């Protein structure tokens, strides 16, 4: 049994998220969770969207808690994708990382393909990743559509917690004031398409482990 596939018509995956895990050592607090991040859809043409890997931006929950603390450090951050359409849908996905907040985004798949977590897959694929979201014991991720921060090669040792707006304002002065506020931005591409009008494909989840560190009341944190 080798070199023999069986093309399904649909990949089913049932996500049942696990409760957040929080645990405090003396001054550091460690949080590990996973929330859903974005929903994706394909078009006849390329489409590059992008995301800040900062805690406010990563999760709806995250932001609300992580905000009670002055500066964090990522320990792990994973973007993993999961399909919703049948294996008949046309179009693939691509993601990779970028780091100088002043760099323009790629416009070509060609381009996109040399970034740090370059990963790509037909839009109907992705169910291998499931354990990462569920966080189960992974089977064989050979084929998953995951991307993970290169946590150890970030520029700052720690980063302050920033609110979107504070960020923005800053960035607006000079885009690379930004280069402190965030360690990296994730880049997404949806090409391959069939409809000129968007077809919804999959959705992707974030899974992190962050160090929290110098308590502040939320109201004062920007």
Residues in 112-141 that interact with its own copies by CB under 8 A: 113-122, 124-131, 133-141
Residue 221 as a binder of Ca ion (CB under 5 A): the answer is: yes
Nearest-approach distance from CB 69 to Ca ion, in angstroms = 9
Number of residues in contact with its own copies, rule: CB under 8 A? 137
Q: Which of residues 42-101 bind Ca ion (CB under 5 A)?
A: 100
Task: Decide: is 165 part of the binding site for its own copies (CB under 8 A).
Answer: no
CA angle 214, 218, 219 (to 5 degrees): 130
The DSSP call for residue 197 is S
| Binding partner selected for residue 216 from Ca ion, its own copies, none, CB under the kind-specific 5 to 8 Å limit | its own copies
From 20, 117, 122, 160, residue interacting with Ca ion (rule: CB under 5 A):
160
Q: Which is nearer to Ca ion, 161 or 208 (CB)?
A: 161
Nearest Cα to Cα of residue 43 among 187, 190, 201, 204: 190
Q: Rule CB under 8 A: is residue 164 a binding residue for its own copies?
A: no
DSSP code at position 158: S
Decide if 155 contacts 181 (C-beta within 8 A).
Answer: no
Out of 97, 182, 188, 190, the residue judged to bind its own copies by CB under 8 A: 97
Hey, CA dihedral for 14, 45, 98, 101, is it positive or negative? negative
> Using the rule CB under 5 A, which residue among 159, 161, 167, 208 binds Ca ion?
161
202 burial level (CB within 10 Å; 0-12, 13-18, 19+):
buried
Q: Tell me which of 181, 182, 186, 190 binds its own copies, using CB under 8 A.
A: 181
Distance CA(18)–CA(9), nearest Å, equals: 29
Footprint of Ca ion (CB under 5 A)? 100, 103, 160-161, 221
């Amino acid at each position: 049994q080798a070199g023999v596939s069986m093309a399904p018509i649909a990949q089913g995956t049932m996500v049942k998220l696990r409760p957040p895990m929080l645990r405090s050592s003396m001054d550091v607090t460690i949080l590990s969770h996973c929330e859903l991040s974005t929903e994706l859809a394909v078009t006849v043409t390329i489409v590059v969207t992008s995301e800040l890997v900062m805690p406010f931006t990563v999760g709806t929950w995250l932001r609300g808690v992580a905000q009670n603390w002055s500066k964090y450090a990522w320990v792990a951050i994973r973007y993993t994708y999961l399909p919703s359409c049948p294996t008949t849908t046309s179009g693939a996905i691509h993601m990779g990382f970028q780091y100088d907040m002043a760099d323009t985004l790629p416009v070509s798949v060609n381009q996109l393909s040399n970034l740090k977590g370059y990963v790509t897959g037909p839009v109907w694929e992705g169910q291998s990743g499931l354990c990462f979201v569920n966080n189960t014991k992974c089977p064989d991720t050979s084929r998953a559509i995951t991307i993970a921060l290169d946590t150890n090669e970030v520029s700052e040792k720690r980063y302050p917690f920033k609110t979107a707006t504070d960020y923005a304002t800053a960035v607006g002065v000079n885009a690379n004031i930004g280069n402190i506020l965030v360690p990296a931005r994730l880049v997404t591409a949806m090409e391959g398409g069939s409809s000129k009008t968007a077809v919804n494909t999959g959705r992707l989840y974030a899974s992190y482990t962050i160090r929290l560190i110098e308590p502040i009341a939320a109201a004062l944190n920007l």
